[PDB]
Amino acid sequence: SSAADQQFYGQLQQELPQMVQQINSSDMQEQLAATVKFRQILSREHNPPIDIVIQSGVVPTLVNFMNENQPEMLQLEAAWALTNIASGTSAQTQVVVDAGAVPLFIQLLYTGSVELQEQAIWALGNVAGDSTSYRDYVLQCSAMEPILSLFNSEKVTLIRTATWTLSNLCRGKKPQPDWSIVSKALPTLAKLIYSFDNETLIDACWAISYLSDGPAEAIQAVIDARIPKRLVELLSHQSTLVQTPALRAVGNIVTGNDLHTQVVINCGVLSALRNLLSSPKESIRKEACWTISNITAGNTEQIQAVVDANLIPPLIKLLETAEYKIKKEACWAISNASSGGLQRPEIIRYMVSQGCIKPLCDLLEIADNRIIEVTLDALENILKMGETDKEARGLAINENADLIEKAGGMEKIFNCQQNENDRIYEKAYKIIETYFGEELVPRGSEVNGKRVSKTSTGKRKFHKKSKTG
Amino acid sequence: SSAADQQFYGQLQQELPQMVQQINSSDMQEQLAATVKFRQILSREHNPPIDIVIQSGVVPTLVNFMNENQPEMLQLEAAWALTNIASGTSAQTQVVVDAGAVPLFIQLLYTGSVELQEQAIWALGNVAGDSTSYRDYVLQCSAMEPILSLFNSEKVTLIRTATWTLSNLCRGKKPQPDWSIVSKALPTLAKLIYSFDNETLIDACWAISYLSDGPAEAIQAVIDARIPKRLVELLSHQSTLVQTPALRAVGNIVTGNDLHTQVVINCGVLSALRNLLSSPKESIRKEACWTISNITAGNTEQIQAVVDANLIPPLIKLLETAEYKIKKEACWAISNASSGGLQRPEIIRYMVSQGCIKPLCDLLEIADNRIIEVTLDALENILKMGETDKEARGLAINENADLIEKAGGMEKIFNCQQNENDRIYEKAYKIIETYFGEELVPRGSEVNGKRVSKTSTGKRKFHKKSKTG
Amino acid sequence: SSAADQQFYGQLQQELPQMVQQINSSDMQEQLAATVKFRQILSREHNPPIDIVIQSGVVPTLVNFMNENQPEMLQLEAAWALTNIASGTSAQTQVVVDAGAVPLFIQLLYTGSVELQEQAIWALGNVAGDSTSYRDYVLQCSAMEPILSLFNSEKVTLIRTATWTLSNLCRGKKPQPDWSIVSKALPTLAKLIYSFDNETLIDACWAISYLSDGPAEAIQAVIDARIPKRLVELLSHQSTLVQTPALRAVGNIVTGNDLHTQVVINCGVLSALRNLLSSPKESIRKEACWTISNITAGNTEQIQAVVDANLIPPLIKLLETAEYKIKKEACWAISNASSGGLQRPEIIRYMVSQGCIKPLCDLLEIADNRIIEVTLDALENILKMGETDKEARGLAINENADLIEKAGGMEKIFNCQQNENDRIYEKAYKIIETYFGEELVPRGSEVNGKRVSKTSTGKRKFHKKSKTG
Description:
3 copies of one chain form a homotrimer. By secondary structure, chain A is mostly helical. Chain A has a single domain (3-440), classed as Leucine-rich Repeat Variant. Chain A has helices at residues 3-23, 28-42, 50-55, 59-64, 72-85, 90-97, 101-111, 114-130, 132-140, 144-148, 156-170, 179-182, 186-192, 198-211, 216-224, 228-234, 240-253, 258-266, 269-276, 282-296, 300-308, 312-321, 324-340, 345-353, 357-363, 369-393, 399-406, 409-415, 422-435. Chains in contact: A-B, A-C, B-C. Chains A, B, C: This is Importin subunit alpha. Chains A, B, C: ARM repeats lie at residues 57-100, 100-128, 268-302.
């Protein structure tokens, strides 16, 4: 702590008693000069003395200064002080809500000027931002409709500020906001993602990411408001601060059913995801793969469209060479594709074509047990495709079984039989028993109690030689 | 891919249509010149264009060129082309078997000359090598007896080639080859391990390694053919390419009962194993320890013979300082010896003499849970030997318990009580409870809910001092 | 082995037969000169030839030389030889006890001079030190009362030697010594911790550490003998060789109930523990934290006294930056304090004040599963305190929940849900479900089989901004 900070706190403690007496004067100017000093110390860019101001007893006074009858200069200074107390911890925000401030903020939305409207909508964002409890209380005193009508303003800083506040009102999942109040905001936010103000864009996107993070009826309401096509367009915005909330909202939509998913596909989301796989920022690449995995969990057509978009090769590259955070998402995408791909085998053949098999087995050795199971399940589907393809063509061999051995991947599957987790073990066993059965036959007589080993590892190499000369 | 490869494939696509027309001519020379070009492109040392030749439709023609009535020059060129298609993938090998080639190969064994015999036996090795399915089909068309009678040849390249083919016919475990057909080969292979041709030796050994990798009746049939004594002699062959299949076959024999095991012991296998423990190649050392562990799982006499051969000290060295792959085999050998060694304690006393106790405990901390259990089981037997020795002599202490503490090994046992696996935990507990019970008594009062610790680690050092002066 | 060692063993084997004949002579001088040589070779500072002397058959002779009728010079030389044989292994000690030596040692305590008393009490320490079996046998031949009466000596080397022997008689836990015999020693040891001889101090402390390592009745007997106040004083002895057995004995006392614990608190042990937290030797710091954890497992007053002693900050430092051995003890101390601290929340508030929350979560990722559970349990109590504090004050938020998220600690708790151990998993789950429930709500629709992720990790940062200008 700087010398200025220490000497500031020395000053304030010595000069707070007069400030408290000055804000209590009958002279309206005294009230105002005192309220300005309280606002200035609370506007301190670093370490506002919020708690010192609270225990001085003046928060009820400042809330009264927001009254109907009070001069606008005073309502604004007091609301700005109260805004900053409310930006602090939850306990500091409670002194403001318990003194009655929230209904007076809401009043200022009607009667204040553009500057008063800005301040009161900002304070309400700090209150709503604090907790689900305060967010709902703000909604419970009917803030929504006066907030919406502020968007027929054209002051940019006012719309910028109410957009941020709007996002705190939609934000939260346990519990969620009341849907019949926050849904009213969707026609406004649908227009706000066409703003040219970047900060307005950002908060509009976040607010839509929160509203779409809900059940089917929430996702449908977002599709009905014709929001998805512009969200997909913003996936190509040049700033990641827009990319991120937009990607998140699109990801939420594809947690829906196949109708929800097909909407974002028809507006071109697969092309956007492709180019987000090369984002310089790792959480974008991670979020993109997660999104894609929600799509490859859909229809064979929607799998086919993922393939048509040339998303298979980039997904393999990441699964091979990306940080574990992303590898685990790339594996979910390929494993979901493997699953639904059973009904159109050619999807699995193209995937095996592109070399998915070795990166799948490579990750069995470094993955947590959830990803091991998704990974085993992908290889199992690949083996399943191989076996029905084998019977169809009369083959003597499962060609995918052969590809999984030739990539080193079978001992890795075999070795996941040594897993504490019974699910893993039972799954790994059934893959070996079904497509690599020779690996479970002991090396000699099996009735003398001698060693049981997988027909010992130093097996002969190659079994077919061509005649070169 | 080289410029030559690309320009080759450009050439072939442009000049394949005439080759196809030339092989279909009525003029026998045309047939032959065309068949020679198909053979030459398929004899390409790298990347034979097998699939291009298959989809050209000529495999039925080449199979017909192997007919009874056809000139030998043509049967040979066609069989050599078909040999090389059959050396490819399983799907490429199917085009050859589904066109009828295998019974005509077998025919060529009777009617062909020495060069035709060579080619057809080679093609049959590629077919048999492909899969159990094709191996059995080859056996199912009665190839075995015409193949055997080729060994009254004395062309070295013919015997070399049929020996390799023979090994593919015996090879495979799920399912195994028909035993009443492949057993017919054992009198021949018994003579073939006395060949001076190294490549014939190698394949003879591999074939015997496959036939002996079977139930008791297979192992007995190998002993009856007087094969074991020469297999043990080849353990000292100067090349590891002979050492390896021979060691594997001997290892298979000692998965039998005590009678099977005693045969290889009487022919001097313990001396051979000793000198294979110092093999410069790590898979030999690993296979040797595994072999020995099958022996130390036998009689007290067979344990006694392992000790008599001075195999204990080298097994301890490896268990101490070898790669985990080998350490785990050395531990199985010592742990099996510990188990049967109970009936003649002096075996366990000599083993403890040589310092087996510390390397056993050292590995408890780095082993998978299968090796931990074998390792705990060895130490348990060592403690069991100590306790019956203790009662016999009137001792106040289990001297082996004392040796296991003095080597740091008891806290390692104690700490395996923190094992996810109940078997481990339950086993480790019973060792501590039975031979280190003080380790389970809490440090003070046990009824006040205070801390429970193993009479805290900073115990006093030494408890008996000698009077020096 | 030196040239001297080899040439010594060459000499002894050649010259042992006459020594054996010389010790059997009728001439008393011959007996004595022979007994002196046997004593000198057995007093060898390194590698006494104990076993060679045993198998020579002379141990019965040397035991007879301790008889009533024998000259004192001879009893002393023979007892000193027998002392050194008894300092060896348990099997070597048995030859001495089975020849009758122990009752003659005890006799020499009555009839010998000060030098004979020294020797026989030393030999008895070697016998008692060997095993519980021999320790009890020594007690069973009524050694205790003649040993105690040696402490009215004032020869320092005699008291030094009998103090060490006394500690071997009390030492041992499975089984323990007979309590109605070793308790007789407590009035003597209470005086012996006021000795100025450091070596007497050390063994007195160890002996008391063994006697106090017993049930409640043992701990009470130590408190009744007014031993605790001097043990706490010796915690500030300048040598760690006194610190260690004294700390151990004090630790044993606080495994008692609250009355036992309050005794060491009233004699100032908290100040001593504080300064032992900075001991340069790591086992002292470890033992000190363990001790403290037995105290923080007591009353709210005894927790309050730990806090009053300013032991909280040093315990956090270690939990943060000490070796895992000590971190695990510091965590037990803070977690016990957290538990009983529920009945006086201000203890938990001061602890959270000092920054215990981040070091607690930091260790969830590197701890074995016992320490993870103690650690989770501490955080759970901290969250429990937060929640009853929350309801009391009307807060919208659990401030401790907020502190645990802001320290990175919630994903660590969340991630311990991926634990093989059901206890861990079930505990970690209930913390998340109860105080971080939003973390278990999936990111979108939950009925379409899409991905289930914790409302994806790339959540927005901050949610309340202050108006700076």
